[PDB]
Scaffold this active site. Sequence first.
Site, PDB file in Angstrom:
ATOM      1  N   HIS A  97      -8.870   7.881 -16.513  1.00 23.15           N
ATOM      2  CA  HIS A  97      -9.240   8.370 -17.738  1.00 23.15           C
ATOM      3  C   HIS A  97     -10.556   8.775 -18.341  1.00 23.15           C
ATOM      4  O   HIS A  97     -11.104   9.495 -19.085  1.00 23.15           O
ATOM      5  CB  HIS A  97      -8.567   7.305 -18.999  1.00 23.15           C
ATOM      6  CG  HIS A  97      -9.261   5.965 -18.720  1.00 23.15           C
ATOM      7  ND1 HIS A  97      -8.497   4.955 -18.034  1.00 23.15           N
ATOM      8  CD2 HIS A  97     -10.169   5.353 -19.176  1.00 23.15           C
ATOM      9  CE1 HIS A  97      -9.249   4.109 -17.922  1.00 23.15           C
ATOM     10  NE2 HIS A  97     -10.388   4.153 -18.973  1.00 23.15           N
ATOM     11  N   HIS A 114     -20.099   6.151 -18.979  1.00 23.41           N
ATOM     12  CA  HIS A 114     -19.114   6.984 -18.946  1.00 23.41           C
ATOM     13  C   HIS A 114     -19.402   7.972 -20.066  1.00 23.41           C
ATOM     14  O   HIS A 114     -19.822   7.849 -20.927  1.00 23.41           O
ATOM     15  CB  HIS A 114     -17.679   6.433 -18.916  1.00 23.41           C
ATOM     16  CG  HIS A 114     -17.299   5.665 -20.205  1.00 23.41           C
ATOM     17  ND1 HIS A 114     -17.432   4.298 -20.261  1.00 23.41           N
ATOM     18  CD2 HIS A 114     -16.827   6.174 -21.339  1.00 23.41           C
ATOM     19  CE1 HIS A 114     -17.118   4.076 -21.566  1.00 23.41           C
ATOM     20  NE2 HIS A 114     -16.852   4.991 -22.274  1.00 23.41           N
ATOM     21  N   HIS A 150     -16.973  10.975 -22.726  1.00 18.64           N
ATOM     22  CA  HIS A 150     -15.655  11.615 -23.302  1.00 18.64           C
ATOM     23  C   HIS A 150     -16.037  12.888 -23.503  1.00 18.64           C
ATOM     24  O   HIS A 150     -17.113  13.363 -24.332  1.00 18.64           O
ATOM     25  CB  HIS A 150     -15.246  10.770 -24.744  1.00 18.64           C
ATOM     26  CG  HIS A 150     -15.122   9.404 -24.400  1.00 18.64           C
ATOM     27  ND1 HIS A 150     -13.827   8.562 -24.323  1.00 18.64           N
ATOM     28  CD2 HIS A 150     -16.138   8.207 -24.310  1.00 18.64           C
ATOM     29  CE1 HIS A 150     -13.885   7.249 -24.138  1.00 18.64           C
ATOM     30  NE2 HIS A 150     -15.395   6.971 -24.382  1.00 18.64           N
ATOM     31  N   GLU A 186     -16.210  11.216 -29.732  1.00 13.98           N
ATOM     32  CA  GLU A 186     -15.391  10.199 -30.480  1.00 13.98           C
ATOM     33  C   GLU A 186     -15.968   9.946 -31.725  1.00 13.98           C
ATOM     34  O   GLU A 186     -15.388  10.244 -32.880  1.00 13.98           O
ATOM     35  CB  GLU A 186     -15.339   8.850 -29.594  1.00 13.98           C
ATOM     36  CG  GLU A 186     -14.674   9.084 -28.120  1.00 13.98           C
ATOM     37  CD  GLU A 186     -14.289   8.051 -27.432  1.00 13.98           C
ATOM     38  OE1 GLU A 186     -14.893   6.984 -27.418  1.00 13.98           O
ATOM     39  OE2 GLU A 186     -12.948   8.031 -27.398  1.00 13.98           O
ATOM     40  N   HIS A 208     -21.458   6.981 -23.114  1.00 18.56           N
ATOM     41  CA  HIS A 208     -21.241   5.571 -23.586  1.00 18.56           C
ATOM     42  C   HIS A 208     -21.763   4.654 -22.558  1.00 18.56           C
ATOM     43  O   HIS A 208     -21.426   4.710 -21.386  1.00 18.56           O
ATOM     44  CB  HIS A 208     -19.599   5.114 -23.865  1.00 18.56           C
ATOM     45  CG  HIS A 208     -19.137   5.740 -25.192  1.00 18.56           C
ATOM     46  ND1 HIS A 208     -17.849   5.898 -25.270  1.00 18.56           N
ATOM     47  CD2 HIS A 208     -19.926   6.254 -26.377  1.00 18.56           C
ATOM     48  CE1 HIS A 208     -17.731   6.137 -26.496  1.00 18.56           C
ATOM     49  NE2 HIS A 208     -18.844   6.584 -26.999  1.00 18.56           N
ATOM     50  N   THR A 241     -12.894   1.773 -27.635  1.00 16.55           N
ATOM     51  CA  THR A 241     -12.337   3.003 -27.941  1.00 16.55           C
ATOM     52  C   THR A 241     -11.122   3.463 -26.942  1.00 16.55           C
ATOM     53  O   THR A 241     -10.383   4.468 -27.226  1.00 16.55           O
ATOM     54  CB  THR A 241     -13.112   4.431 -28.234  1.00 16.55           C
ATOM     55  OG1 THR A 241     -13.634   4.909 -26.852  1.00 16.55           O
ATOM     56  CG2 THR A 241     -14.410   4.042 -29.041  1.00 16.55           C
TER      57      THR A 241
END
EC number: 4.2.1.1
Length: 258
Positions: free
Chosen positions: A62, A92, A94, A104, A117, A196
């Site tokens: 992910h 990591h 997103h 996010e 993050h 999240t």
Amino acid sequence: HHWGYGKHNGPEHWHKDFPIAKGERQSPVDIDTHTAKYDPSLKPLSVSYDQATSLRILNNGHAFNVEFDDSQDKAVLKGGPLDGTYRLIQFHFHWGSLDGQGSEHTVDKKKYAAELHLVHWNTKYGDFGKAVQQPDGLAVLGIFLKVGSAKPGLQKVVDVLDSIKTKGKSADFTNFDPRGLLPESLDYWTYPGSLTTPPLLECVTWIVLKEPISVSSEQVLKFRKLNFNGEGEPEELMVDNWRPAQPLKNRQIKASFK
Ligand SMILES: CC(C)c1ccccc1-c1ccc(S(N)(=O)=O)cc1
Ligand SMILES: [Zn+2]
């Protein structure tokens, strides 16, 4: 049929396995800059990353995690809204399929190209697994990415991604200095929220920096070459691995700055 970010297992489905998805302190949120209140009692953030020990980079299906040795106080976040000492465990990102989406958190509904993050756990709970069971267990430092000039400190991450293309692949990743991912200013917004991703636990003090970092188009393009699938499976590009903004409910976002 596990959770993910596809048509059939994406954020709108998560509540079925993880009912807390519709809880009272879910993340991310939209940051309404005009409604956030300056809190003069907030301290400057203390980011102490000089002794950080990165170990490994992992594609977990992910995102990719850059993991750190958190068996001692080597890389810690303190101050700001936090009481006590939080240890860096991993970072990591997103990101989107296009530069117009991927973050996010949003700022006055603005979506950035990506969001970093830096995940830290409260050392008073002894380890990460215990910390996520506590309302003040984690502190996540969130940093927006916009597309423009390259971020030189990101390039070592970009260049190892071809070695972890698919789910479950890892690579040695030592001596990476996360200080090279920070913007100039540590001005921030803060609010109580959640992980999240599933299990969406409500254990996070969120600290989101106002100043985004700039990364190049080539850098973000390389993020988009990763795969959600395992090796020898049909290719599904790892893009749009972001959860959208959730209801603020009974929460106030505080600003460290006027
Ligand atoms: C899955 C979650 C419990 C987890 C396990 C191990 C290491 C990290 C995490 C974790 C997952 C997501 C986040 S996030 N997206 O920053 O809220 C922060 C931490
Ligand atoms: Zn995250």
